[PDB]
Nucleic acid binder design. Structure first.
Lengths: 92, 83, 402, 812, 142, 427
RNA sequence: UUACUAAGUCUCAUGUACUACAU
RNA sequence: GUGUAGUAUCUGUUCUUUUCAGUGUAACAACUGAAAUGACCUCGAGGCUC
């Protein structure tokens, strides 16, 4: 993540699925963790969804998220939107 | 830890986007990336492809496109030499 | 102080005319309450996009769609077991499947699903510039000029559904000329020509891929090394009458090959040549092949750099055995055309990368396979036929020019 | 080969260990399963997952390992088919959907490992299990094996082994496997529809009633899987399905009706009416079901028929409305939960076709009845019908009857029935302008429900008042405002937090509908009364109080002393970063109006003075307040005072300034373009400052500022800002290096690569082994974001490199 | 060893260069010196800021001690908040005033110094004296 | 809106592929065409004036054939006001002079070979200087006069080391020049009489591959790219003051007093600042085509605002209209800002309604943002793109009124007014 | 008329801030 | 107004085996290994010295 360093990402070709984030993490752009003017919903590779792990918050990787994560307009222009599958594999 | 992550992201970005100069990169390795991307865009835009077709004067345009594709590999020079 | 700051207002008065992509689908149903006909075409130049119909034997502007503000790097229609809507890939990497709809009093282009791929730019890693769709519309495949290839499995429902991408990554293999082979629903199979990026020698090797719907991944099948002179691949539909084993047509420069998937049959047929061979004479090539099949008769049209339009049919060679043969002949030719389509009607749309797109209806259909004079066979692969071009224009008849 | 047993310990390393250390075991076993022995490998892999200790992630790992082993040991999996079939069979019949999915995947992998003949020879002799559970498990196993090994690949063998007349066991197992395959495949039964109907039609006229019921169930499953279109194969048994509706007895007629309920919606428009008329002889006659299996089936069939477009609304009102109202529309199911749901759903589905007024004037009795059990279901169905149809089909007498029934249900709410609470708002919304003539009825109802002084009763009353507040108070009355405000501010100290939140919401709705001083509670009294309420730690209470304080300063921005508003803002500034995002949104929604009413200069000075206090654990939120107060007129009122706060010599203050500048820029996309030039002299001393902190946060300013201002034409200023950045590239530390990288990447968008390139190029290689490592980071990010963009800008000439490109010099 | 001693002389490298005066002694150890000379001496490239090879972390500057804390742009100084709030060791303002200062008054306004295409800020540099310099070449005439 | 033009023109294919197009300066419109042969090197010249073409002499043919002459580049020149000559540059590296004749009521074109001159370079670019041919070698710029039996070198100007080749170049009122490169960018020269040389007074900022180049003014330049960038540059006022207040003869040698910063940029950065000034980027734009021809028209169909219209290679014609006043570009800028993220606004509305109860690229149909696509190679600077705001016209009234609510400014109707104002009034 | 550059490492002391942790 | 552990930063102080070779470095630095002993001449320097 932008702040916590040891957090590792996925970075695969995103699928059709949309990543979920919990109400606790709601509002953060999964890359920069910004609250401003979100744009496009996150898309994750199928390898990050499958079973129960699909329900996890793509940000904090623990809680079960209801909400969809959106990229901000700064990351959508920086292109990090399309970089790959954001997810946090290690808890940190 | 942080730099150590930058190493892994160096491996991933290098894998996806092919040539990315890390620290020490030979001029042969890097110039090859230059040639590959320049040709890539010359053939990639139908615009510049149409342009090189006429300025070169080839009989067909796909000759220029597949020419650039072939020109991406180094051995294509010797290949032309053997014609 | 007055700020200079020149403020320019850009307008496109006339929109880009070099048509780089086309698709054969039937998009909108207009002026008719209930009608379904496969005869229609949508053609795209980068930004600019247009939709033409014929149905009269004469091409017609339908509507000039709004400016997309991107570089469309490939466009192919998809037909699924329904209104046929076109899959469109461009810069941003997004695979954008769009349906042309009638909204308010005009035809507007609606998008269904856009899938993010690579980044926003024209790139070599970008899985664009090479695209094709399963002729039965089960799956769409994008690839990159070099790095990687992605194939989505397309499914239709109350809402359209694009399956997760199927990745194959070959680091040093530069891909060129994606050509997908039709199937009977067995399994989708696509064919490419991979030129190695890092090598001591120039090596252009064809490779076959069978996507396995059962195992849900693309499988490398046959890697056949061919001369560096290779140009393109075309798909021979079945050869079900002669002897899952797809057969491809590899256009080289001065001759044509066809190759089996199992490598059992490799047929070399030397491409004929003009009589004049004016001044600078290249080994030429064939720029565009296409396939057509009707009444057990399937012929393909492959045009050289000079614009010479040729056909192939397959013969069993009943004397020896039942085995494929390859027979070239000569047609009306044309000017160099980037891509060729054929309606279910006898109309053949010739999209010229040079200047003008023009449509035909073929009647003579060309010379019969019986003549040994002007027709070449796979009997003797080493042979040459010289021919004088025909401006009399017997075979093909221009209907409409653009 | 005893080391393979240690591979099981390696499997523990795949379970107990690290992700890469766990995947390495699978990657190694993938290339070693062929040299491990199929017998011992299976004997060690199957019991490992067969034990109850197989967790969810453990089950997934074991399934992946078994799939890899099968992909490696394809022919070797044949002798072990008797093992997995005895293990994967129960797991496929588990309760959780994940367990059944994993079992089906394991069965499909085992089937694809060997051939179809092995699966046939394994599942065929397993039909001797007289237990119904074992027989169903074997049928599901065969269906899963056929769903992956090819439906027509096992269709002929199954049709040849089941078409005999051995006993009822095989005849039942055939239809069971057919239904299981149709349920597991799903929409993939289109091509194999007729191919399966040809073998399933042997039970439509079967002698044994059990075989007939199994065939009917299989036909219904196939029709549901292949629905809605494609009823061609359904015509192969459509005649018996339409004939035997009033021909079978008990279970036979039940199965026939269950199949017809699925076949009707998939049928055409012509034969649908005939099929409905032929099935009504046994459906409408037996509408009263002695048991639940018949009643639920009849309800589902009626719902499916109502969904079909064949039987129009006239036929339903003629032959379907009276029977459905007599045998079904009654309070006889006041306790059946499944029946209360099924009948309610069927009524809600049929009301849209038979007209809402046809049922709104016929269901005004079940809700007003003294039986609260059936009254709850009646109110639920009424609310569903009102939400589906709306308020068009509402007669005067029908509307009066509905209002009377709703009032009687709300007054006679002896239990905690939320159905009436949810339907009251829907009825009030359906009233619309008609609620004005019906004002005093609902007014007295709300008064009696509010003055009851009951906790749950007061909560429900406040909820219903807040739901129907804008419909009643906004009717241009100016008479009930005082009567509502006198009772609203009365119970202000409710100990129950939910009741307090409901009262706050009702007061907010009243203040939104009422004005100053049209509202009954005085503004000068409600403000100091609501002030301590915002200090509460309750989530919903504080969330409602924030919106109440915001709407208090809506139409009337005054109604307060400036000191009171300043104190309220200082108190709410600490809640701008709460855990619940709703409070964080409400705080920003209220602070905007608060600052617009108070004043720009006063709020700006207060926020600036607050920067030094409230040390950096919640200080940044105050900066957000600066950026939140500069959104009504833009950031042209906050920025000048910010720049002075930067003129202050204190480091921490300057840092808070620069970061506040970052955030105030990221919150404004199109605003900063005009403000950019006034920033650059401030970043002049920032980027030049010796402190890596100031250089860091200044770079963070350049990130957002450059991203949102890119392409505006300020590049000449961006050129400056960069010219100060380039020397900082060599600066170490993770925070500094990533902030500076992101800053330079933002500059790539505002300048374009070309100049940004020019720097990167003149530093691109270099001997220093350090300078090189540093700049190749920036060039890596540049190559990531841009490639074609950099193509023209490569400083490459024929003397620069050997091959160059021959096609760049072409000129036409 | 041999590669370190294989290096051509910098003056041997000068001849390959159209603008030989940019190349410096350390370019001898450039792993690809013939290439690095072409890039570094290419037309529009801007040589690396020279604060590298110094261990001072780019700012030890004695001049940094004597730098002014800040000065408001005179257009913003017109807004009078300088007197309203004392930054050196409440002030009611008008929305029209502030808005007009940035837009009506300050639309055409631009910082006086800025910098140029290849301007790079070395540690010892201070722009302010050069600002008074450029302004002075303007006002003062013989 | 879709067409804005009409095109006045068995299988028909001509062996001759056209090359360039020329027009006489003295005759207001007389258009001479030059083609090539695909085959043995051969050419044709077809002149048209007024309605249809011309005959050649008394012959039936309407065109002239030139055997063994191929044209790499060609331009027509009038050395004297009463005489008209044509200029060919052969791939043999030979400069061929011709003479044009109009028969006038016998009317026909008669071309006459005059001289033969050997050339060192291919001559990719040439144009009309006063009384002279102004041509560009690969490295250097030669100004040929009129000699007899062959044409003479009147003056030669050696280029700065940066320029490898000259693709195209253009002049401003014979005093000034803008010289383009393949690799590098435009560099402006000034003709100095009695110095008999062009002196470069300004460099360009970045590397840009310039296909075609023109002048709007004395101090500004239009240029396109091989890669599709349409840009316009301006000399800095620091340079304009110097050249307005000084004679060109003092630039090369003599006393010209440069501010302290310029010299410090000369010794500090001799490679970039060799030309001692720099073009501040003025306008930048990206049109995905490759612009062949710019033309600056003082008026487009009598319109006041002078436009510049360009034809691209892949084919296109488009215009850049300078906007008078400000609130023109303020309203236009706000409309472009609306239509830019309009697809995102639809996505956020469609998102909120899903929170209370259409993909992201709905309105754009493609993922590319406007600022991103049009920025591309280099960010658009002052140019606002009208081709976007034009899409606002097609959207339904519900969508348009949904978009314009973001403005406190005028209603959708006045929006459409301002949008449609450009084609009407500005051309 | 003086044409503009000095501290570094170690050692043993002094100057001043700070970070976890406990009453 | 305290204690436990620990950190950073000034300043003071001072120059570590004379050399060789390797690593290392942009060059330094730093690190790694060994060790001359004796005689003579001119003004710490110097030796085709033995």
């Amino acid at each position: 993540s932008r702040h916590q360093f040891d957090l590792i990402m996925c970075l695969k070709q995103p699928g059709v699925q949309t990543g979920l984030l919990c109400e606790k993490c709601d509002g953060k752009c999964p890359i920069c963790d910004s609250y401003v003017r979100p744009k496009r919903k996150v898309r994750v590779c199928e390898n990050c969804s499958f079973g129960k792990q699909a329900k996890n918050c793509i940000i904090c990787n623990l809680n079960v998220g209801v909400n969809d994560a959106f990229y901000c307009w700064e990351c959508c222009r920086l292109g990090k939107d399309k970089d790959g599958c954001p997810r946090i594999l290690n808890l940190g | 830890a942080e730099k150590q992550r930058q190493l892994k992201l160096q491996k991933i970005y290098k894998q996806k986007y092919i040539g990315l100069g890390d620290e020490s990169t030979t001029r042969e390795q890097w110039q090859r990336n230059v040639r590959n991307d320049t040709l890539n865009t010359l053939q990639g835009h139908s615009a510049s492809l149409e342009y090189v077709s006429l300025s070169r004067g080839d009989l067909s345009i796909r000759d220029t496109r597949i020419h650039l594709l072939k020109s991406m590999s180094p051995g294509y020079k010797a290949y032309l030499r053997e014609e | 102080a007055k700020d200079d700051e020149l403020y320019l207002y850009h307008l496109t008065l006339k929109k880009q005319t070099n048509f780089v992509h086309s698709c054969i689908g039937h998009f909108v149903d207009l002026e008719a309450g209930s009608k379904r006909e496969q005869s229609q075409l949508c053609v795209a130049t980068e930004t600019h996009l247009e939709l033409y119909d014929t149905a009269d034997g004469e091409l017609k502007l339908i509507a000039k769609f709004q400016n997309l503000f991107a570089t469309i790097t490939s466009m192919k229609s998809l037909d699924l077991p329904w209104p046929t809507f076109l899959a469109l890939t461009s810069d941003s990497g997004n695979l954008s499947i769009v349906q042309i709809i009638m909204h308010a009093g005009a035809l507007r282009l609606k998008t269904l699903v856009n899938q993010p791929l690579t980044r926003t730019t024209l790139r070599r890693v970008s899985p664009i510039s090479y695209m094709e769709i399963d002729p039965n519309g089960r799956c769409i495949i994008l690839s990159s000029v070099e790095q990687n290839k992605l194939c989505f499995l397309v499914d239709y429902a109350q809402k359209l559904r694009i399956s997760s991408p199927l990745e194959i990554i070959r680091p040093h293999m530069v891909t060129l000329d994606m050509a997908v082979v039709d199937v009977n629903f067995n399994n989708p199979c696509f064919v490419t020509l991979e030129i190695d990026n890092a090598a001591t020698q120039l090596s252009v090797h064809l490779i076959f891929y069978v996507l396995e719907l059962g195992l849900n991944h693309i499988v490398k099948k046959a890697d056949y090394l061919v001369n560096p002179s290779a140009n393109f691949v075309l798909s021979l539909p079945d050869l079900s009458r002669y002897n899952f084993n797809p057969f491809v047509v590899i256009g080289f420069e001065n001759h044509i090959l066809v190759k089996d998937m199992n490598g059992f049959f490799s047929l070399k047929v030397e491409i004929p040549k003009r009589s004049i061979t004016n001044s600078r004479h290249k080994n030429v090539t064939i720029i565009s092949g296409i396939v057509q099949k009707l009444k057990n008769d399937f012929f393909v049209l492959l045009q050289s750099n000079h614009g010479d339009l040729f056909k192939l049919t397959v013969s069993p060679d009943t004397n020896d055995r039942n085995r494929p043969l390859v027979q070239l002949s000569y047609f009306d030719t044309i000017q160099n055309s980037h891509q060729l389509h054929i309606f279910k009607n006898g109309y053949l749309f010739a999209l010229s990368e040079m200047n003008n797109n023009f449509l035909f209806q073929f009647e003579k259909l060309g010379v019969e396979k019986n003549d040994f004079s002007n027709v070449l066979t796979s009997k003797d692969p080493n042979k040459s036929l010289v021919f004088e071009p025909s401006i009399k224009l017997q075979n093909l008849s221009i209907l409409s020019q653009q | 080969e005893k080391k393979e047993r240690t591979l099981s310990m390696l499997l523990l390393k795949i379970k107990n260990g690290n992700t890469a250390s766990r995947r390495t075991s699978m990657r190694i076993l993938t290339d070693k399963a062929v040299t491990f022995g199929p017998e011992m490998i299976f004997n060690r892999l199957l019991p490992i997952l067969l034990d109850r200790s197989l967790e969810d992630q453990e089950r997934h790992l074991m399934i992946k390992t078994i799939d890899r082993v099968l992909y490696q040991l394809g022919d070797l999996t044949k002798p072990y088919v008797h093992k997995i079939l005895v293990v994967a069979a129960p797991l496929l019949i588990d309760e959780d959907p994940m367990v059944r999915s994993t079992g089906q995947e394991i069965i499909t992998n085992l089937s694809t490992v060997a051939g179809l003949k092995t699966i046939l020879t394994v599942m065929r002799p397993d039909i001797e299990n007289e237990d119904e559970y074992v027989r169903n498990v074997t049928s599901r196993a065969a269906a899963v094996v056929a769903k992956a090994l090819g439906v027509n690949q096992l269709l002929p063998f199954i049709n040849a082994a089941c078409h005999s007349r051995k006993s009822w066991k095989a005849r039942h197992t055939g239809i069971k496997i057919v239904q299981q395959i149709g349920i597991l495949l799903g929409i993939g039964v289109l091509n194999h529809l007729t191919g399966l109907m040809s073998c399933i039609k042997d039970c439509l006229m079967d002698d044994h009633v059990p075989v007939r019921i199994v065939t009917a169930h299989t036909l219904s499953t196939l029709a549901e899987n292949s629905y809605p279109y494609g009823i061609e194969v359904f015509n192969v048994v459509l005649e018996p399905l339409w004939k035997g509706i009033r021909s079978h007895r008990g279970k036979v007629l039940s199965s026939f009706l269950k199949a017809v309920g699925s076949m009707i919606p998939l049928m055409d428009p012509e034969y649908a009416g005939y099929y409905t008329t032929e099935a009504m002889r046994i459906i409408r006659r037996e509408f009263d079901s002695p048991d639940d299996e018949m009643k639920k089936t009849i309800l589902l069939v009626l719902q499916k028929c109502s969904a079909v477009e064949s039987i129009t609304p006239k036929f339903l009102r003629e032959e379907i409305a009276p029977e459905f109202f007599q045998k079904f529309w009654v309070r006889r199911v006041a306790l059946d939960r499944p029946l209360n749901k099924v009948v309610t759903y069927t009524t809600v589905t049929l009301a849209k076709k038979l007209g809402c007024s046809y049922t709104i004037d016929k269901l005004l009795t079940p809700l007003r009845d003294e039986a609260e059990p059936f009254r709850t279901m009646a109110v639920h169905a009424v609310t569903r019908t009102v939400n589906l149809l709306g308020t068009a089909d509402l007669d005067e007498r029908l509307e009066t009857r509905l209002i009377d029934a709703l009032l009687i249900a709300f007054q006679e709410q002896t239990n905690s029935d939320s159905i009436i609470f949810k339907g009251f708002g829907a009825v009030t919304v359906s009233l619309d302008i008609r609620m004005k003539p019906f004002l005093a009825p609902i007014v007295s109802t709300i008064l009696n429900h509010l003055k009851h002084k009951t906790p749950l009763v007061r909560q429900h009353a406040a909820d219903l008042c807040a739901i129907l507040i804008p419909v009643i108070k906004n009717c241009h009355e100016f008479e009930m405002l005082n009567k509502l405000n006198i009772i609203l501010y009365e119970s202000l100290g409710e100990v129950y937090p939910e009741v307090l939140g409901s009262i706050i919401n009702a007061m907010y709705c009243i203040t939104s509908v009422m004005d100053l001083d049209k509202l009954q509670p005085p503004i000068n009294q409600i403000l100091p009364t609501l002030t301590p309420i915002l200090r509460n730690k309750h989530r919903k209470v504080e969330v409602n109080t924030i919106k109440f304080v915001g709407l208090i300063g809506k139409l009337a921005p005054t109604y307060a002393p400036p000191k009171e508003w300043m104190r309220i803002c200082f108190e709410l500034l600490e809640l701008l970063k709460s855990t619940n995002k709703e409070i964080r949104r409400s705080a920003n929604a209220t602070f905007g109006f608060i600052a617009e009413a108070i004043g720009p200069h006063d709020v700006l000075v207060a926020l600036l003075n607050n920067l030094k206090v409230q040390e950096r654990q919640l200080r940044v939120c105050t900066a957000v307040a600066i950026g939140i107060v500069a959104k009504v007129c833009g950031p042209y009122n906050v920025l000048p005072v910010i720049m002075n706060e930067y003129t202050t010599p204190e480091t921490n203050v300057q840092n808070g300034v620069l970061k506040a500048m970052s955030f105030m820029f990221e919150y404004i996309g199109n605003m900063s373009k005009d403000y950019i030039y006034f920033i650059t002299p401030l970043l002049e001393d920032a980027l030049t400052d010796r402190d890596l902190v100031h250089r860091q946060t200044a770079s963070n300013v350049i990130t957002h500022l450059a991203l949102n201002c890119s392409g505006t034409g300020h590049e000449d200023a961006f050129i400056h800002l960069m010219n100060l950045l380039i020397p900082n590239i060599f600066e170490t530390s993770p925070h500094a290096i990533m902030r500076i990288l992101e800053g330079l990447e933002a500059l790539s968008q505002a300048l374009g690569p070309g100049l940004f390139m020019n720097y990167i190029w003149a530093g691109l290689f270099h001997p220093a082994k350090n300078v090189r490592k540093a700049f190749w980071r920036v060039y890596n990010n540049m190559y990531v974001m841009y490639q074609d963009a950099m193509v023209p800008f490569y400083p490459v000439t024929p003397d620069n490199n050997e091959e160059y490109i021959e096609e760049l010099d072409l000129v036409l | 060893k041999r590669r370190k001693t294989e290096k051509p002389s910098l003056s041997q490298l000068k001849s390959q260069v159209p603008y030989p005066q940019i190349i410096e002694w350390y370019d001898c150890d450039a792993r690809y010196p013939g290439l690095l000379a072409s890039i570094k001496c290419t037309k529009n490239v801007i040589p690396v800021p020279s604060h590298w090879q110094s261990k001072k972390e780019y700012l030890s500057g004695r001049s940094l001690l004597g730098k002014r804390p800040f000065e408001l742009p005179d257009i913003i100084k017109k807004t009078n908040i300088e007197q309203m709030r004392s930054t050196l060791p409440a002030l009611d303002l008008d929305y029209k005033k502030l808005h007009d200062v940035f837009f009506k008054i300050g639309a055409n306004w631009k910082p006086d110094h800025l910098l140029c295409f290849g301007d790079v800020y070395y540690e010892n540099r201070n722009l302010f004296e050069e600002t008074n310099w450029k302004r002075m070449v303007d006002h003062k005439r013989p | 809106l879709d067409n804005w033009f009409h095109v006045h023109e068995m299988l028909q294919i001509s062996t001759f592929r056209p090359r360039t197009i020329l027009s006489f300066p003295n005759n207001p419109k007389s258009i001479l065409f030059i083609d090539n042969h695909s085959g043995k090197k051969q050419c044709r010249i077809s002149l048209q004036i007024d309605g249809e073409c011309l005959k050649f002499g008394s012959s039936d043919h309407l065109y002239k054939i030139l055997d063994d002459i191929d044209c790499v580049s060609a331009a027509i020149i009038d050395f004297t006001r009463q005489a008209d000559h044509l200029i060919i540059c052969a791939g043999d590296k030979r400069l061929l002079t011709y003479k044009i004749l109009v028969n006038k009521d016998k009317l026909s074109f008669d071309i006459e070979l005059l001289h033969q001159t050997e050339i060192i370079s291919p001559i990719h670019a040439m144009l009309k200087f006063k009384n002279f041919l102004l041509t560009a070698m690969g490295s250097t710029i030669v100004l040929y006069g009129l000699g007899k039996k062959q044409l003479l070198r009147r003056s030669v100007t050696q280029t700065p080391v940066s320029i490898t080749k000259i693709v195209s170049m253009h002049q401003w009122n014979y005093e000034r020049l803008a010289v383009g490169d393949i690799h590098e960018s435009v560099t402006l020269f000034i003709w100095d009489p009695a110095g008999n040389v062009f002196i470069p007074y300004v460099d360009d900022s970045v590397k840009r591959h310039v296909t075609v180049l023109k002048f709007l003014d004395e101090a500004t330049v239009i240029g396109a790219d091989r890669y599709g960038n349409a840009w316009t540059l301006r000399s800095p006022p620091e340079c304009e003051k110097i050249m307005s207040n000084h004679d060109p003869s003092e630039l090369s040698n003599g006393a010209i007093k440069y501010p302290l910063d310029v010299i410090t940029l000369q010794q500090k950065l001799p490679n970039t600042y060799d030309c001692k000034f720099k073009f501040q980027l003025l306008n930048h734009f990206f049109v995905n085509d490759i612009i062949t021809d710019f033309h600056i028209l003082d008026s487009l169909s009598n319109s006041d605002r002078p436009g510049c219209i360009y034809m691209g290679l892949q084919g296109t014609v488009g215009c850049f209209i300078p906007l008078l006043s400000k609130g023109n570009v303020f309203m236009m800028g706000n409309i472009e800002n609306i239509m830019a993220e309009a697809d995102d606004t639809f996505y956020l509305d469609y998102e909120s309604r899903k929170k209370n109860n259409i993909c992201e690229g709905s309105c754009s149909i493609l993922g590319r943002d406007h600022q991103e696509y049009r920025s591309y190679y280099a960010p658009v600077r002052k140019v606002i793109d009208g081709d976007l705001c034009e899409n606002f016209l097609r959207l339904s009234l519900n969508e348009q009124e949904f978009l314009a609510k973001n403005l406190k400014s005028v209603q959708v109707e006045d929006i459409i007014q301002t949008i449609n104002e450009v084609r009407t009034n500005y051309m």
